[PDB]
Design a protein around this ligand. Structure first.
Ligand SMILES: *c1cc(=O)[nH]c(=O)n1[C@@H]1O[C@H](COP(=O)(O)O)[C@@H](O)[C@H]1O
Ligand SMILES: [Cl-]
Lengths: 257, 257
């Protein structure tokens, strides 16, 4: 009952942004999302260009980009179109509906204007989704709900995770998936993206816990690995990205049969 | 026995930021925080100056400020020092430790460089606090933990709320209190700040729910009301600020005896 990414792109209830992503995943043989956790535009753009062919998605961190401008994002969009990847902004929206609407659409960042995908916490209740949707729906954007977190002590467990899944189901015109550590929905229209991924066992000094691509994709049933430091800290970020891409792709192929 | 704000300001285990806030609350007879939910610097600085005398705190929304610069924040600080109120940035930090550290210190906004107070969601586990504290402690800052939310379908209930209180207790060198709808800790060194406050019954059309100053300060035992639209959308903003200040203050006096 496992389907390829390319077949999932054709599912009757699939959102257009999800279909676009699934098609490029299949085309490029990648289910790797780069977490571009860097402070300078030059580095962001150079990683985007060099690793573009290896990734299905680049996760931006505009709240840490010391030299953000909208022109930087225009250049990133050019690279995304060229190399074929989606732009996912990291910011974990987590406020009442009316607030997150403005945080998404406006300020200096104007996130909705350039991000294909955003993510939201479900702790406020579904108003968080509803607010983001008022902005992103006509822009053909999608949203991921944070159903589980990778960090030590995470409270996104049990009934909380179930609430996230229900909320996604009830807002499928805009919610395209989850940030989670494993498959949390049985519905194949939903994407599972998993951060906290490295080839080596370990964690960091501030509560991050790591699992491998083979574990996350192969055994836990997620779709896409989100990798920051496992790539960013490497001497050769391109080689690192290729190792992560192969790991995640081959784990996916093995669950297909 | 309930202590006055002035007496709480002198408690041996009080955090310096909380002491500063409690002293000016007592001095100015105000336990009102203005939520400065505006898009333009001119509007933020106008409200800060006009309403400064009536408030103990101004909650900024830098993620919606279309013309943010550091010079705007220098000028806001000058108003805060003149009128005597603290600056509390709204952004509900909600990510792993390593990420929120950078979101707090860096980017274009450099929140730690001008906000007295920040707030965090507890969903990621205690790393969210550890990460923020690594930046906030050197900068003499404080943090509030979001123990309850004002919105419909909030998951910040029960064991989640209890987890927030334990996290605060264990990080009392940085955490000075809570965003909550009610008193959640019995320790008088912690502040309670409550959003979703208006004089009349109701909500917004994106899940916000409202309670009155008398209910939240008097019956529910909170310390400070956070008010945005109840003031900002009024014809006469100074009069509205004064109505909320008087309401919150009298509720406090009555609980005190
Ligand atoms: C988001 C949600 C979550 O549960 N765990 C996370 O780590 N994140 C974000 O993903 C990235 C992890 O990066 P790294 O540990 O691979 O360097 C990071 O951007 C974090 O905010
Ligand atoms: Cl709030």
């Amino acid at each position: 009952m496992e389907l390829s990414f390319g077949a999932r792109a054709e599912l009757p209830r699939i959102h257009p942004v999800a279909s676009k992503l699934l098609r490029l995943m299949q085309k490029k043989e990648t289910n790797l999302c780069l977490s571009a956790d860097v402070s300078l535009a030059r580095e962001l753009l150079q990683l985007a260009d060099a690793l573009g062919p290896s990734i299905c998605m680049l996760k931006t961190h505009v709240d840490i980009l010391n030299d953000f401008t909208l022109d930087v994002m225009k250049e990133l969009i050019t690279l995304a179109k060229c190399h074929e990847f989606l732009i996912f902004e990291n910011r974990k929206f987590a406020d009442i509906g009316n607030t997150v609407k403005k945080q998404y659409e406006g300020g200096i960042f104007k996130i909705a204007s350039w991000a294909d995908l955003v993510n939201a916490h479900v702790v406020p209740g579904s108003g968080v989704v509803k607010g983001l949707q008022e902005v992103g729906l006509p822009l053909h954007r999608g949203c991921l709900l944070i159903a589980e977190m990778s960090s030590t002590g995470s409270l996104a467990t049990g009934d909380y995770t179930r609430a996230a899944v229900r909320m996604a189901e009830e807002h499928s015109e805009f919610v395209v998936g989850f940030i989670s550590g494993s498959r949390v929905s049985m519905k194949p229209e939903f994407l599972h993206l998993t951060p906290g991924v490295q080839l080596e066992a370990g964690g960091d000094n501030l509560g991050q816990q790591y699992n491998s691509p083979q574990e996350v994709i192969g055994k836990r049933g997620s779709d896409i690995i989100i990798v920051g430091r496992g790539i960013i800290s490497a001497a050769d970020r391109l080689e690192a990205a290729e190792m992560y891409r192969k790991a995640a792709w081959e784990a996916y192929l093995s669950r297909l049969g």
